[PDB]
Amino acid sequence: SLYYEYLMNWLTKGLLRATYGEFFIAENTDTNGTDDDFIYHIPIEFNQERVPAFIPKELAYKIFMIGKSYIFLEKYCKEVQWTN
Amino acid sequence: SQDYCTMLYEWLTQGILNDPYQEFMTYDDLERAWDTQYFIRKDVLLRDCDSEEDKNLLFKMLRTGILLKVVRASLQIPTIPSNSSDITIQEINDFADLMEGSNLELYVDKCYSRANEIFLKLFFQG
């Protein structure tokens, strides 16, 4: 139930709030001078080794992409009303 | 947070500052009296005002209230009728939801649109 809450947060808000490394999508602001301000990056990585066995890797990639596209639309496309 | 939502709704839709306990984000000085200066109590803010979008939202709230107070003071009226614009604002009936995410940003955006519409109507016509 709480993992479903994790997934629901990520899928409807792009949130990785209080997951403590239990989610297969971790915020990754670790850069090496390339794109320090995330102009090209969207600093979020997707660990394929952390996908739980009860989620198909295709649906895991779809989850990652839904969250990435929500964050994209809300932060860079400034589409606030539609994202909300 | 119900009374805080009430104060914020009043400041966002009518520019009224009824703050007897020194609580709201902003307040008028000077208790002739028109060169008013506003302040912002940094301590009582809802968002920490560190990043750029938080400052954008904070100053959008402040400007919405300022413009609505100007409109309300020019016409010598105590409140702005709810029909003065096509953009109508609802009351904040769930503060937790309002502060959940971009909800506050859209709420302040609607209030700012209504305030700018009324202010520009008033200046460019009256």
Q: Per the CB < 8 Å rule, is A80 touching B103?
A: no
B106 close to A (CB below 8 A): yes
Report how far residue B12's alpha carbon sits from residue B111's, in angstroms, rounded to the nearest whole number. Answer: 6
Q: Per the CB < 8 Å rule, is B105 touching A83?
A: no
Report how far residue B14's alpha carbon sits from residue B69's, in angstroms, rounded to the nearest whole number. Answer: 7
Experimental method: cryo-EM
Resolution in A: 3.0
Report how far residue B6's alpha carbon sits from residue B67's, in angstroms, rounded to the nearest whole number. Answer: 19
CA–CA–CA angle A70, A51, A4 (5° rounding): 60
A84 close to B (CB below 8 A): yes
Say how many CA atoms lie within 13 Å of B75 toward its Cβ. 19
B109 close to A (CB below 8 A): yes
Report how far residue A5's alpha carbon sits from residue A24's, in angstroms, rounded to the nearest whole number. Answer: 14
Query: Between B52-74 and B103-125, two packed helices, what is the crossing angle to 10 degrees?
Result: 40
Kindly list the residues from chain A whose CB atom is less than 8 angstroms away from the CB atom of residue B101.
13, 84
CA–CA–CA angle B113, A82, B6 (5° rounding): 45
Strands A44-46 and B26-28, bridge-based pairing: unpaired
Side chain identity, residue B79: T
Report how far residue B29's alpha carbon sits from residue B10's, in angstroms, rounded to the nearest whole number. Answer: 18
Closest to B122 in 3D by CA, of B78, B83, B81, B71: B71
Q: Per the CB < 8 Å rule, is B101 touching A80?
A: no
Q: How close, in Å, is residue A49 to chain B by CA atoms?
A: 30
Report how far residue A20's alpha carbon sits from residue A23's, in angstroms, rounded to the nearest whole number. Answer: 8
Select from B106, B108, B110 the residue whose CB has the most chain A CBs within 10 Å, as the one to mutate to test that interface: B106
Between A and B, how many CB-CB pairs are < 8 A? 13
- Tell me if residue B40 falls in helix, strand or coil: strand
Q: How far is CA B56 from CA B34, B42, B52, B64, in A?
A: 26, 15, 6, 12
The most distant pair of C-alpha atoms in chain A lies apart, rounded to whole Å, by 39
For residue B39, list its beta bridge partners. Answer: B27
B102 close to A (CB below 8 A): yes
Report how far residue A16's alpha carbon sits from residue A5's, in angstroms, rounded to the nearest whole number. Answer: 11
Cα B65 off chain centre by: 3
Report how far residue B55's alpha carbon sits from residue B49's, in angstroms, rounded to the nearest whole number. Answer: 5
What single string gives the DSSP state of each residue in B83-107?
A: TS-S--------HHHHTTSTHHHHH
